[PDB]
Nucleic acid binder design. Structure first.
Ligand SMILES: Nc1ncnc2c1ncn2[C@@H]1O[C@H](COP(=O)(O)OP(=O)(O)O)[C@@H](O)[C@H]1O
Ligand SMILES: Nc1ncnc2c1ncn2[C@@H]1O[C@H](COP(=O)(O)OP(=O)(O)O)[C@@H](O)[C@H]1O
Ligand SMILES: Nc1ncnc2c1ncn2[C@@H]1O[C@H](COP(=O)(O)OP(=O)(O)O)[C@@H](O)[C@H]1O
Ligand SMILES: Nc1ncnc2c1ncn2[C@@H]1O[C@H](COP(=O)(O)OP(=O)(O)O)[C@@H](O)[C@H]1O
Ligand SMILES: [Mg+2]
Ligand SMILES: [Mg+2]
Ligand SMILES: [Mg+2]
Ligand SMILES: [Mg+2]
Lengths: 183, 183, 183, 183, 183, 183
DNA sequence: TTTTTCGATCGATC
DNA sequence: GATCGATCGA
């Protein structure tokens, strides 16, 4: 057990213990969770999460690019139209699928921001630790939200790291700066 | 329970652990759930779901062919008019019966894609891993939703793998699929 | 101990497990319940549920007849005018009393079919396994809905098994069914 | 454990026990928290939680200053919009970030008082012990709550300690409550 | 633990057990509390609970009079805005602070009576026994509740034992009951 | 513990196990209750439970008489606006006080019926062995449950044992006859 | 168990 | 004026 406590308290979250000594995590699982939350070393997020938007008409292999962006061991495909992040437990790359505007504006800002955040799950809370949010969508970011119900739409475009677009060509071409508002 | 952990991390289904090991699942039943949920290795969808729309006027055995699709056991029946996939627990056949369009259009566009998804249950979420969604109905897929209310709009009529109509009180004739927009 | 699981897998009921081996049921009770709930498939239904409609002028001794169909201890008396079948555990007389057109049309058509359904309580879902539905009403089954709002429109009468009527202060007469639209 | 309980009863803080001998805190973690609740040595608040308010248009570095106010080992970043102080098991700094009024008025009045408070966590209760509440906002404290729908707007202002404001696109300058409705 | 059970049987207070033998109280705390509940030697209430009401404009110093009143160690500052009394576990100042009616009417009548009452926590129920309640407000009690939406509002004023006011920027001059309404 | 089950499964549970075997009940307290509930030996009831209903404006000693009815040792007070019957681990006066209609009507009837019942507490279920329910109110007993919201108002009337109104501010008088819809 | 989640009320838009 | 959606409270 002190081995499990070593691998937990020294560094990481419960996932590393689950990968190191499972037989000591099937037992004492609630107490490792409370030790982690009380020790204070529960991993915050102190980095910048890249945000790659993808735009294209339905059928252009949008989601294929997302599923091929990283290994399926480290992709959390967020369920749609919910505020719940259930099952996450840290999964580096987060692909918000086909996102037409079904997330609160300030919450979308805070996912794409660069400072700690704890997202919510059904009956608990899980610390957000993503590193590349792939926002697969259908329209340009200028049609997700309306300027009426938003403080300032620039506050989101400031965070879109890259932006792949689909034009009348079988390839998907990145966007060099902004023809529209700059990112 | 050393064998139980090594068997759980490979098959990734608690039912298999219980069946292959009754005794060590009576104890540590919660811990195995948390180990599965945290370690990863949960069975996620990475295949294509095969939609089989069945359509005809009432009383023609729409449901008869729905439950005919083997087995009578491994067939989740989606609760009507609702959002929650409660109690699903992992099946392979999902028979949405007597459809009108009650599932939101985007959720139906997403049930029939080729990528992981997480459905909602009243108290959590359960991974959705289905291989055929028998959408029994009464109308053709053209009039499930209003012509203007759908914004895509040809993203459902792509993924409809099969189709069966009901002709003039004679038999269920497999629709050839060419007359309508292609499938 | 080990023999508890041996006696559970050959019973299918916890009651005998408690009777024969109580000492190891005072401990480990939570796990036998989970084992039964996870190793035994949920109970579907495949039996046409008889729908005996009771209709007459008000106050004609309808409720007493309803309770007299079967044992009152296994009879539900569904909370009227809402959509929460508060469990009730599966109780296999169902008496919807004073029905006058408030359940949705397709929901009622589904409640009286040969294929499984799952009505929902507040905070969960209960499998619906009814051998008899006793629709006690006030007026004719054709006045429950108008043919404009119902695009079926004669699909209910297939599901009605028989009909019970009260003639001009003679008795609760059992209908022929051959004069009006057939049963 | 026989010594761990001795430390717990006289240190009065579960964090101390969790850091001294984690292994006997992994087991018996409910027990220690319940002994601490019963014995009465659970830590209250009797000091004044000095509240810093930061204002300025987005992207000007409000959040960076908030992460540079204290060590990241202690700053608890409040989860947004959802009134659940989960992940808190103490220590001084609390940075409610990007505030716009998403907290009930009385709770914002009562966090900043000098007297004990217990906040909700997801299935429990955590005592509040902060020493600095850095509220970060884009709007002056006037536009957080409407004057008419508030019993007395002067109550919140009395509890603000410092007010830092961004001016003229060069650098944020501390205010003294002259121009603002003073505190 | 036989000594601990016997020393609980006659004293009937978990506080005493936790004072004498913490170690046993750490390991089995649900057991001792349930044993105390079942044996019937709980602590019912048979005494009128004084309700001192303080009214004044904010900043006049209402709450400092509550914070100094009985003892810093035997006051339970009620968590606001909700019906949970967690962590209370005995005794006898209960100071509902900053009140304006955010507690259910019948429950507020019932807190201020002579007959027993069990109050609700996150995990179970802890018996209520308060020798004096201090209620702090900004309005007079005449407008804590809608005078129309309450059947008989005299039943609250009858329970207040002392209604202490704030005069014209001088002091907290105790008002005399029965003049303006009953007391 | 072997003898514990033998004593448990005779009668009069769990009060007599807790009296006779204090040590073995500190452990296994959830499991003895579960074994007893599973077996058909929860000391059931066949006696029509008495219902005394009191009506009078507040301050007229409604609840005083309820307190002065039986021995306080064997009295339970139902905490209002709360469907949990925690504290029923003794019995047999039940005084639902200060009623305004806050119980589900069918359950209220079920408490006043003759059949055996099992109410649910925080941590399982408890048999409802009541003999006298002193339903104390302040308004006319009819208005508690609206006739539209109830299938039959007279069903509640049938199980009332006795009723008491209040006189012209002097006396408690027993109501005799058919001033309202009698039983 | 609590949480849910569900239901009711209020506000805004057509 | 009615229906649907969103937000808040329990
Ligand atoms: N494992 C796979 N095997 C074969 N083809 C695949 C696989 N994964 C993706 N594809 C192809 O990628 C395409 C994805 O299309 P689809 O997901 O419907 O559109 P979008 O990706 O834009 O949502 C399909 O046409 C399919 O042929
Ligand atoms: N480690 C770092 N190295 C260089 N620049 C940094 C570092 N951390 C933060 N910054 C800068 O500080 C700024 C903080 O931005 P942000 O937190 O969005 O401001 P606010 O939250 O107030 O809108 C970023 O623009 C970034 O360039
Ligand atoms: N350090 C201090 N110096 C001077 N006055 C103080 C200090 N701390 C608190 N007070 C005074 O104590 C009183 C009570 O504080 P508080 O309870 O927060 O206000 P309220 O009575 O409105 O709830 C206030 O009037 C405040 O002016
Ligand atoms: N020891 C006592 N001394 C004086 N009066 C008492 C005592 N015990 C009970 N009472 C009286 O009993 C009455 C209870 O009535 P009330 O509080 O109106 O009941 P409820 O609030 O439940 O309707 C009070 O008026 C109170 O004066
Ligand atoms: Mg897609
Ligand atoms: Mg910020
Ligand atoms: Mg105060
Ligand atoms: Mg009363």
């Amino acid at each position: 057990l002190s081995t499990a406590v070593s691998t937990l308290l020294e560094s990481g979250s419960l996932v590393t213990v689950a990968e190191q000594h499972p037989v000591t995590f099937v037992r004492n699982f609630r107490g490792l969770a409370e030790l982690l939350k009380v020790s204070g070393k529960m991993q915050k997020r102190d980095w910048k999460t890249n945000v790659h938007v993808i735009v294209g008409p339905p059928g252009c292999g949008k989601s294929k690019w997302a599923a091929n962006f990283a290994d399926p061991e480290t992709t959390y495909w967020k369920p749609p139209r919910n505020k719940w992040w259930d099952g996450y437990h840290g999964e580096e790359v987060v692909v918000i699928d086909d996102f037409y505007g079904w997330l609160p504006w300030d919450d979308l800002l805070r996912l794409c921001d660069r400072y700690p955040l704890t997202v919510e799950t059904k009956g608990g809370t899980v610390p957000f630790l993503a590193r590349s949010i792939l926002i697969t969508s259908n329209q340009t970011p200028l049609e997700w939200y309306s300027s009426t119900a938003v403080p300032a739409v620039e506050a989101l475009y400031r965070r879109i790291t890259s932006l792949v677009f689909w034009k009348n060509a079988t390839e998907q071409s990145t966007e060099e700066g902004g023809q529209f508002v700059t990112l």
